[PDB]
Amino acid sequence: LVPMVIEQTSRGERSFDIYSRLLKERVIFLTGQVEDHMANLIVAQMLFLEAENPEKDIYLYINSPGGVITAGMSIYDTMQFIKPDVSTICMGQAASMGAFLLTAGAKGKRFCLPNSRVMIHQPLGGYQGQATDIEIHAREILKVKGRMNELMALHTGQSLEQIERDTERDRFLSAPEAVEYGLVDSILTH
């Protein structure tokens, strides 16, 4: 159940869901494992907000533990295309795709909470079967990692060699240390 909040208007009060009223204020929330339906839902919200206002920033709260990589790419390609800068405020955990989504955020508007934690590791698409088919599948995952790492380094600016070395094994970064690494430009506290 979602609480219904009335939004005062000159015509009169109209009841709306808590998420609905937040969307009216350019606030979009993200949570749960990334899914095609979930990714497409956040995509429709981004497009509607851009048409409503093409300048005001659209907030994007990421509190997800990671999900399918392919689903996440749709969100990333929709965020870059839209003219308004996305404010990727990380309010909690941020797995591989979680880190990728917040890093895609426009520079100068990315914020992080004091006690948030961003976990970055490599993608895992392990499949078992005939060696012939695995070759193409094996080639594909590296290409996504290379493409993601290339785009990731473009946003952050760190050396590609260092990023792959670190991303080979699971890495945990604190909110203070995250800004040092360049994941988030600033921290929001007050």
Binding site: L47, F48, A51, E52, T78, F81
Partner: protein, 369 residues
């Protein structure tokens, strides 16, 4: 001419009586006419003038003073209503056609629907037209008709009811003022059933009240300003790929108005958003009005060109139009002068001036006596 003109214009009397009085009224007018012995004969021109007075309608043959006024009617209006030239063009052409004699014998002089963004000068052009032509403006606010049963005041209540004796407003108004301008502001706000009355008004130029009397709308200009246009000015599409949106825009009015009502409209004028250059002219008009009011007391106000440009930008609004300019002009220019005029140097002020300081970012009001 008398018999034909009377039936064409005089509709409240029968042919033998109305025709005979025209002939009798013409001779009587001719009796006091020979100030210089001009009592030779009564011609057709005299019959047209006497009928024009009985029915209170402009004479058939346009004069040479009425003719001169219609030549520069559009230019005269542009001095007070800047922009929206096509609106003036349609109004001026319709008035010229009806006087020349090419008008519709069973329809009003003009039926033009005005739409567009708020504050673009819809009621001003109508009010200025009435003032320019010396025509009594009949104003009916459609905001008092937000219910289906409000039409009882336009044509009157039926017999046997509380309002039978009082009569209708619109029918009596047109009967008292055969030659007038009809303005229905915010027509869309009115109930969809009020449009049905206007149908016969525009098609046959006749309306019947609860008393059986017929109102003549052939010599009245019907203007119905609406704010529908403001809705489609955004032209925004919620999609990754944008669209032109030209076809969908301006089609909402067809949904709220039956095609019957629109099919009998002479034209559907659209008011474009006020241009930035036009805002400067509007400021001059307001300042001129303030100067005239001040000139009655004897005070003379002078505004620097720089102040006008900054003042216009301060109140420039596309959505709200030039309505905000009234407030900024009153709050900034008029309010400082109120205390001085009542008690101060401006009691008998002369050569007053005003200006603005760029670094200060505010106005500078000076006074002299």
């Amino acid at each position: 001419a008398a018999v034909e003109l009377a039936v064409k214009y005089i509709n409240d009397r029968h042919l033998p009586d109305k025709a005979i009085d025209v002939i009798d009224e013409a001779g009587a007018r001719a009796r006091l006419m020979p100030v210089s012995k001009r009592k030779k004969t009564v011609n057709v021109a005299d019959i047209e003038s006497v009928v024009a007075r009985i029915a209170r309608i402009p004479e058939k043959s346009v004069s040479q003073s009425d003719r001169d006024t219609l030549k520069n009617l559009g230019d005269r209006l542009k001095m007070l209503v800047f922009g929206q030239d096509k609106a003036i063009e349609a109004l001026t052409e319709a008035i010229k056609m009806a006087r020349a004699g090419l008008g519709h014998e069973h329809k009003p002089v003009g039926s033009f629907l005005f739409a567009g963004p708020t504050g673009v000068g819809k009621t001003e052009v109508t009010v200025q037209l009435s003032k320019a032509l010396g025509i009594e403006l009949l104003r009916f606010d459609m905001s008092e008709y937000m219910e289906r049963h409000t039409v009882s005041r336009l044509i009157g209540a039926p017999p046997g009811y509380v309002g039978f004796d009082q009569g209708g407003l619109l029918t009596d108004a047109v009967i008292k003022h055969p030659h007038a301008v009809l303005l229905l502001d915010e027509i869309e706000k009115a109930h969809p059933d009020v449009f049905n009355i206007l149908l016969q008004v525009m098609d046959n130029g006749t309306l019947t009240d609860n008393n059986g009397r017929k109102a003549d709308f052939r010599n009245v200009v019907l203007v119905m300003t609406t704010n529908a246009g403001v809705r489609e000015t955004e032209r925004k599409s919620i999609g990754l790929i944008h669209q032109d949106n030209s076809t969908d825009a301006m089609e909402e009015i067809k949904k709220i108005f039956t095609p019957e009502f629109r099919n009998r409209l002479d034209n559907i004028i659209w008011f474009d958003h006020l241009s930035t250059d036009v805002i400067h002219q509007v400021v001059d008009k307001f300042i001129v009005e303030l100067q005239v009011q001040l000139d009655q007391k004897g005070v003379s106000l002078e505004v620097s060109q720089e102040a006008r440009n900054w003042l216009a930008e301060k109140g420039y609004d596309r959505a709200m139009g030039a309505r905000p300019m009234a407030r900024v002009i009153q709050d900034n220019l008029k309010k400082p002068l109120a205390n001085e005029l009542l008690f101060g140097s401006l009691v008998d002020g002369g050569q007053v001036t005003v200006a603005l300081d760029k670094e200060k970012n505010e106005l500078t009001y000076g006074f002299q006596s």
